[PDB]
């Protein structure tokens, strides 16, 4: 049952919205800097995973991806308008995207994921 949008409250990993799957963009909004948005997706077979989050408002935001054991496997690179990055998932399991805004008022966004998901 893939999602197309975040589902509040999703302010922790235990309440993360998901799963996210390739080919189905996910919409949300960072409401203000106190809004933390967590998502999850499942890796079923080893492979490269790519994440692109289009920033559809002004502000500083970024994301980190965690594995099930709270290790960070991937951090965002800002190109100005997209927060992107990729990693090699050596092991199947659930991964979590932690998205937040460190400095901004209001940010819509759109998550796209590609690869072995
Ligand atoms: Ca949230």
Swiss-Prot record:
The entry's protein name is: Collagenase ColH
Domain of life where this protein originates: Bacteria
Q: Where is this region: S3 collagen-binding domain?
A: 3-117
Protein localization: Secreted
Q: Where does Ca(2+) 4 bind?
A: 6, 8, 29, 35, 37
Q: Where do the TM regions start and end?
A: none
Chain residues that bind Ca(2+) 5: 8, 10-11, 35-37
Region (Collagen-binding) residue ranges read 100-102
Q: What else is known?
A: Clostridial collagenases enable the bacteria to infiltrate and colonize host tissue, and contribute to gas gangrene (myonecrosis) pathogenesis.
Give the family, as the similarity comment puts it: Belongs to the peptidase M9B family. Collagenase subfamily.
- State the residue spans of region: Disordered: 1-20
Q: What does this protein do?
A: Clostridial collagenases are among the most efficient degraders of eukaryotic collagen known; saprophytes use collagen as a carbon source while pathogens additionally digest collagen to aid in host colonization. Has both tripeptidylcarboxypeptidase on Gly-X-Y and endopeptidase activities; the endopeptidase cuts within the triple helix region of collagen while tripeptidylcarboxypeptidase successively digests the exposed ends, thus clostridial collagenases can digest large sections of collagen.
Use in biotech reads: Widely used for tissue dissociation due to its potent activity on connective tissue.
Reported modifications of this chain: Upon purification gives rise to 98 kDa, 105 kDa and 116 kDa (full-length) proteins, all of which have the same N-terminus.
Question: According to its record, what is known about the domains?
Answer: The mature protein has 4 domains; a metalloprotease domain (S1, approximately residues 41-717), S2a (718-810, equivalent to PKD 1), S2b (811-904, equivalent to PKD 2) and a collagen-binding domain (S3, 905-1021). The protein has an elongated shape, which lengthens further in calcium-chelated conditions; calcium-chelation also increases its susceptibility to exogenous proteases. The S1 domain has the collagen hydrolytic activity.
Instruction: Return the annotated site residues (Collagen binding).
Output: 75
Q: What is the lineage of its organism?
A: Bacteria, Bacillati, Bacillota, Clostridia, Eubacteriales
């Amino acid at each position: 049952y893939p999602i197309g949008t975040e589902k509040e409250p999703n302010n922790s990993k235990e309440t993360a919205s998901g799963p996210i799957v390739p080919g189905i963009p996910v919409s949300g909004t960072i409401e203000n800097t106190s809004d933390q948005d967590y998502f999850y997706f499942d890796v079923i077979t080893p492979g490269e995973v790519k994440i692109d989050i289009n920033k559809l408002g002004y502000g500083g935001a970024t994301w980190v991806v965690y594995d099930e054991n709270n290790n960070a496997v991937s951090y965002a690179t800002d190109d100005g308008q997209n927060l992107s990055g990729k990693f090699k998932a050596d092991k199947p399991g659930r991964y979590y995207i932690h998205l937040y805004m460190f400095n901004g008022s209001y940010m819509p966004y759109r998550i796209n994921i590609e690869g072995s998901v």
